[PDB]
C-alpha cells in the first residue's frame with residue numbers, strides 16, 4: 001500500500017556532533033531505478049555509529065546513521081533483479097557492484113562504489129531520499145538504518161534466507177562479519193597459533209570467535225575494562241590481560257607471554273597507539289597484525305619501519321575482507337546451521353525509540369551490542 | 375699450513391664514521407669451536423656497507439665491514455660439520471641456526487642469532503677474532519668480508535657448488551637474493567600484475583628480475599637518477615619515471631599510470647618518505663608494498679592508517695625472506711643452471727686494495743655493484 005508513495009515515518013536524525021539523536025518525523029521518497037526501499041526490523045548499535053556522533057568518523061551532517069541492520073523489502077525501483085518485495089535483506093555498508101577492478105579481484109572487497117573513503121552521504125546518484133523539517137538529510141555508508149524505512153542502492157543490499165531471525169542476523173551486517181572475517185580471511189589464522197586481540201567489544205569478540213574457529217591454540221584478549229573478560233573467555237579467549245595491571249608496556253608483556261611474540265595480532269579499538277602496540281607484539285620475523293579499529297579522522301601514526309623490515313606483515317580491512325553481497329547470504333545460512341553464535345554479542349534489546357539509551361549503554365562500557373527493534 | 379695459527383693479513387678498517395676505509399695489517403685468530411676461517415675471493419660493495427660509514431646504520435666501531443662475499447674455507451674449528459677446508463662458501467649476514475622458533479617456522483628467516491637487531495659486532499661468543507696493533511676490531515653482521523681472511527660462526531656460512539664463479543656469486547650473499555626474494559617470496563608477485571620498484575641500484579634491479587620472473591606484465595622503475603633507467607629496462611622494467619620530472623607527487627603519477635594503483639610496490643632506497651609513497655601507490659583494496667631499504671637509525675615515519683584499513687598489506691623483509699643456509703646453495707645451483715643472470719648487476723671490478731675507489735663509484739651514482747677481488 002505504500003508502493004510508489006512518500007512514506008512519513010520516524011527516524012533518529014543527527015543534526016550536530018556530540019548531541020543526542022533526535023527521533024522525529026522524516027519523509028522517505030520511493031525508490032528510483034535500481035534502488036530498494038526497506039522496512040527496518042532490527043539494527044545494532046556499532047561503535048562506528050558513535051564515531052559519527054563524536055567526530056571520530058567524518059561524514060556529512062545532518063545524517064541518518066546506522067549501518068548494522070536487517071529488514072524486509074517494502075518496494076523495488078525499476079530494473080531491480082536481486083531482491084523482491086517481501087524479501088528479508090541486510091543492507092551492505094560496503095557495496096558489491098560486481099563490475100569494478102576490486103570486485104573482479106579475488107582478494108579485494110572494498111568496492112570502488114563505496115561511500116567510505118570520500119563520503120558524500122548520498123545515494124549512488126548523488127541525491128538523498130530523506131527529508132526532515134523540509135531539509136534534505138544525508139545517508140550514511142549507503143545504508144542509514146536508524147529509520148523505520150530506508151532506501152538503498154541495489155549493490156548495497158543482500159537477500160537473505162526467508163526464515164532468518166532478523167533481530168540476531170543484523171549483526172552479520174557489520175560487527176560479527178568484520179571480526180570473524182578479520183581472523184579467518186584477512187589474517188588467515190592457522191591451527192595451533194597464538195593470537196592477541198586488542199579490544200573486547202562486539203567486533204573483538206567476533207575476532208576471537210574466528211580465531212577459535214581457525215583452531216588457534218592461544219587467544220589472548222586485551223582490554224582496559226576487565227568487565228569484558230568473562231565474555232571474551234566464553235567465546236574462546238584462553239587468557240585476558242588488562243594493560244593497567246602491568247608496569248611494563250603491554251607489547252612487552254605479550255611478547256613474554258608468547259615466548260617471543262604472537263603469530264597474529266588484531267587492533268579492534270581505533271587508537272593510533274594501540275595500532276602500533278599490536279604490530280609490535282607480533283613475532284618480528286613472521287607475525288601478522290591486522291588493523292580493524294577506525295582511527296580518528298585525518299590523524300597519522302608514527303612508527304619505526306624496522307618493525308616491518310624484520311619480516312612482520314601489517315594489514316587492515318573493511319568488513320572482514322568479505323565481498324559483501326556474495327558473503328552475507330552465506331553467513332546467514334551458516335548462522336542458521338549454527339556454525340557460529342550471535343547471542344553472546346547481544347547484551348541488551350531495546351525498542352528503537354530508546355536509541356539514546358542504547359548509545360549511553362555503549363559509552364558507559366556496559367553493553368556489547370544493543371539491538372534496536374522497530 | 376695456517377690451520378691453528380694466527381694469520382697476518384690486510385683488511386679494510388673503518389675507525390670512525392664518515393671517513394675513508396683504512397687498509398691495515400690485522401691479526402686474524404684461528405677459529406674456535408663451531409667457527410670457520412675463510413680466505414676471501416670476492417666481495418661486493420653494498421649500500422648497507424656505506425650506511426655504516428654514513429651513520430645510517432649503527433654498529434660498534436672500529437669495524438671490518440663487508441657482508442656480500444664468497445671465498446674458500448682455509449680451516450675449521452672443533453665440531454664443524456657443514457663445510458670443510460677447500461670448500462667454496464658464501465658467508466651469511468643473516469644466520470640459520472636451525473633450532474630457534476624462527477628457523478623452525480615455514481616462512482621466517484630472521485634467525486634469533488642475528489647481529490642485526492641489537493648489534494654487538496662480535497662472534498656468537500661475544501668476542502672478536504680481529505686485532506689491529508693490539509686493539510680489538512669489531513665484526514659486522516657476523517661476516518666481515520672486507521679482509522683477506524675472516525672468521526665466521528658455522529651458522530653464518532653456506533657451502534656452495536665447487537665449480538661456481540666466486541666473482542659473480544658473491545652477489546647471492548646479499549643484493550641479488552634480497553631483491554629477487556623480495557619479489558618472488560615476500561611479495562609473491564603474480565602473473566600479469568603491475569609492479570613499481572623505487573630505487574634502481576643493485577637490489578632494485580634484482581627486484582625487477584624477480585618481478586619479471588614471476589610474470590609481471592608491467593614493471594615501473596622509479597629513480598631520481600635517470601642514468602639508472604637503461605639498465606633497469608634491460609633487466610625487465612617496462613617504463614621508468616623520475617619524480618624530479620613531475621610537478622606533482624609520484625604516488626599520484628603511479629596511481630594514474632596504473633589506473634588506480636599498482637598490485638605490488640617495493641621500497642628499495644632507504645628513505646621514510648619513499649616508504650610511505652610506495653605504500654600509497656599500491657591499490658587501496660588489494661595492493662601489497664614491501665620495504666627493502668634500510669631506514670636511518672632510530673627514525674620513525676608518519677602515515678595515515680586508513681591506507682591499511684582499506685585493505686593494503688605492508689611488509690618488509692631481510693635477505694628477500696630466504697632461510698639463508700638452505701637457500702644460498704640452491705640459488706647458486708640455479709645460477710649455474712642459467713635460471714637468472716648476475717652480470718647485469720656488475721659494473722666495475724677492482725682489486726681489494728682499491729676499496730675506497732669502489733665506494734666513490736657507488737656514492738657518485740656511477741656503479742651498481744663493484745666487485746672487489748683478492
Ligand SMILES: NC(=O)C1=CN([C@@H]2O[C@H](COP(=O)(O)OP(=O)(O)OC[C@H]3O[C@@H](n4cnc5c(N)ncnc54)[C@H](O)[C@@H]3O)[C@@H](O)[C@H]2O)C=CC1
Pocket residue numbers: 046047048051174175178198199200201202203204222223224225228243268269270271274291292293294295317318319320368683
Ligand atoms: N574495519 C571495519 O570494517 C570496522 C571497524 N569497526 C571499528 O572497530 C572498533 C571496535 O568496534 P566495537 O567492537 O563496536 O567497539 P567497542 O567500543 O564495543 O569495543 C572497543 C573495546 O576497546 C576497549 N578499549 C578502549 N581503549 C582501550 C585501550 N587503550 N586499550 C585496550 N582496550 C581498550 C574498550 O574497553 C572496548 O571494550 C571501532 O573503532 C569501530 O569503529 C567496526 C566495524 C567495522
Ligand SMILES: NC(=O)C1=CN([C@@H]2O[C@H](COP(=O)(O)OP(=O)(O)OC[C@H]3O[C@@H](n4cnc5c(N)ncnc54)[C@H](O)[C@@H]3O)[C@@H](O)[C@H]2O)C=CC1
Pocket residue numbers: 309420421422425548549552572573574575576577578596597598599602617642643644645648665666667668669691692693694742
Ligand atoms: N632488507 C635487506 O635485507 C637489505 C637491504 N638493503 C638496502 O636496500 C637499499 C638499496 O641498496 P642498493 O641497491 O645496494 O643501493 P643503491 O644506493 O645502489 O640504490 C639505491 C637507488 O635509490 C635511488 N634513490 C636515492 N634517493 C632516491 C629518491 N629520493 N627517490 C628515488 N630514488 C632514489 C638512487 O639513485 C639509487 O639508484 C639500501 O638502503 C640498502 O641498505 C640492501 C640489501 C639487503
Ligand SMILES: O=CNCc1ccccc1
Pocket residue numbers: 046048049057067093116174294317318319683
Ligand atoms: O562499522 C562500520 N563501518 C565503518 C568504517 C569506517 C571506516 C573504515 C571501516 C569501517
Ligand SMILES: O=CNCc1ccccc1
Pocket residue numbers: 309420422423431441467490548668692
Ligand atoms: O645489506 C645487508 N644487510 C644490512 C641490513 C641491516 C639492517 C636491516 C637489513 C639489512
Ligand SMILES: [Zn+2]
Pocket residue numbers: 095096097098099100101102103111112113
Ligand atoms: Zn565494485
Ligand SMILES: [Zn+2]
Pocket residue numbers: 046047048049067068174175
Ligand atoms: Zn559497524
Ligand SMILES: [Zn+2]
Pocket residue numbers: 469470471472473474475476477485486487
Ligand atoms: Zn635460528
Ligand SMILES: [Zn+2]
Pocket residue numbers: 420421422423441442548549
Ligand atoms: Zn647488503
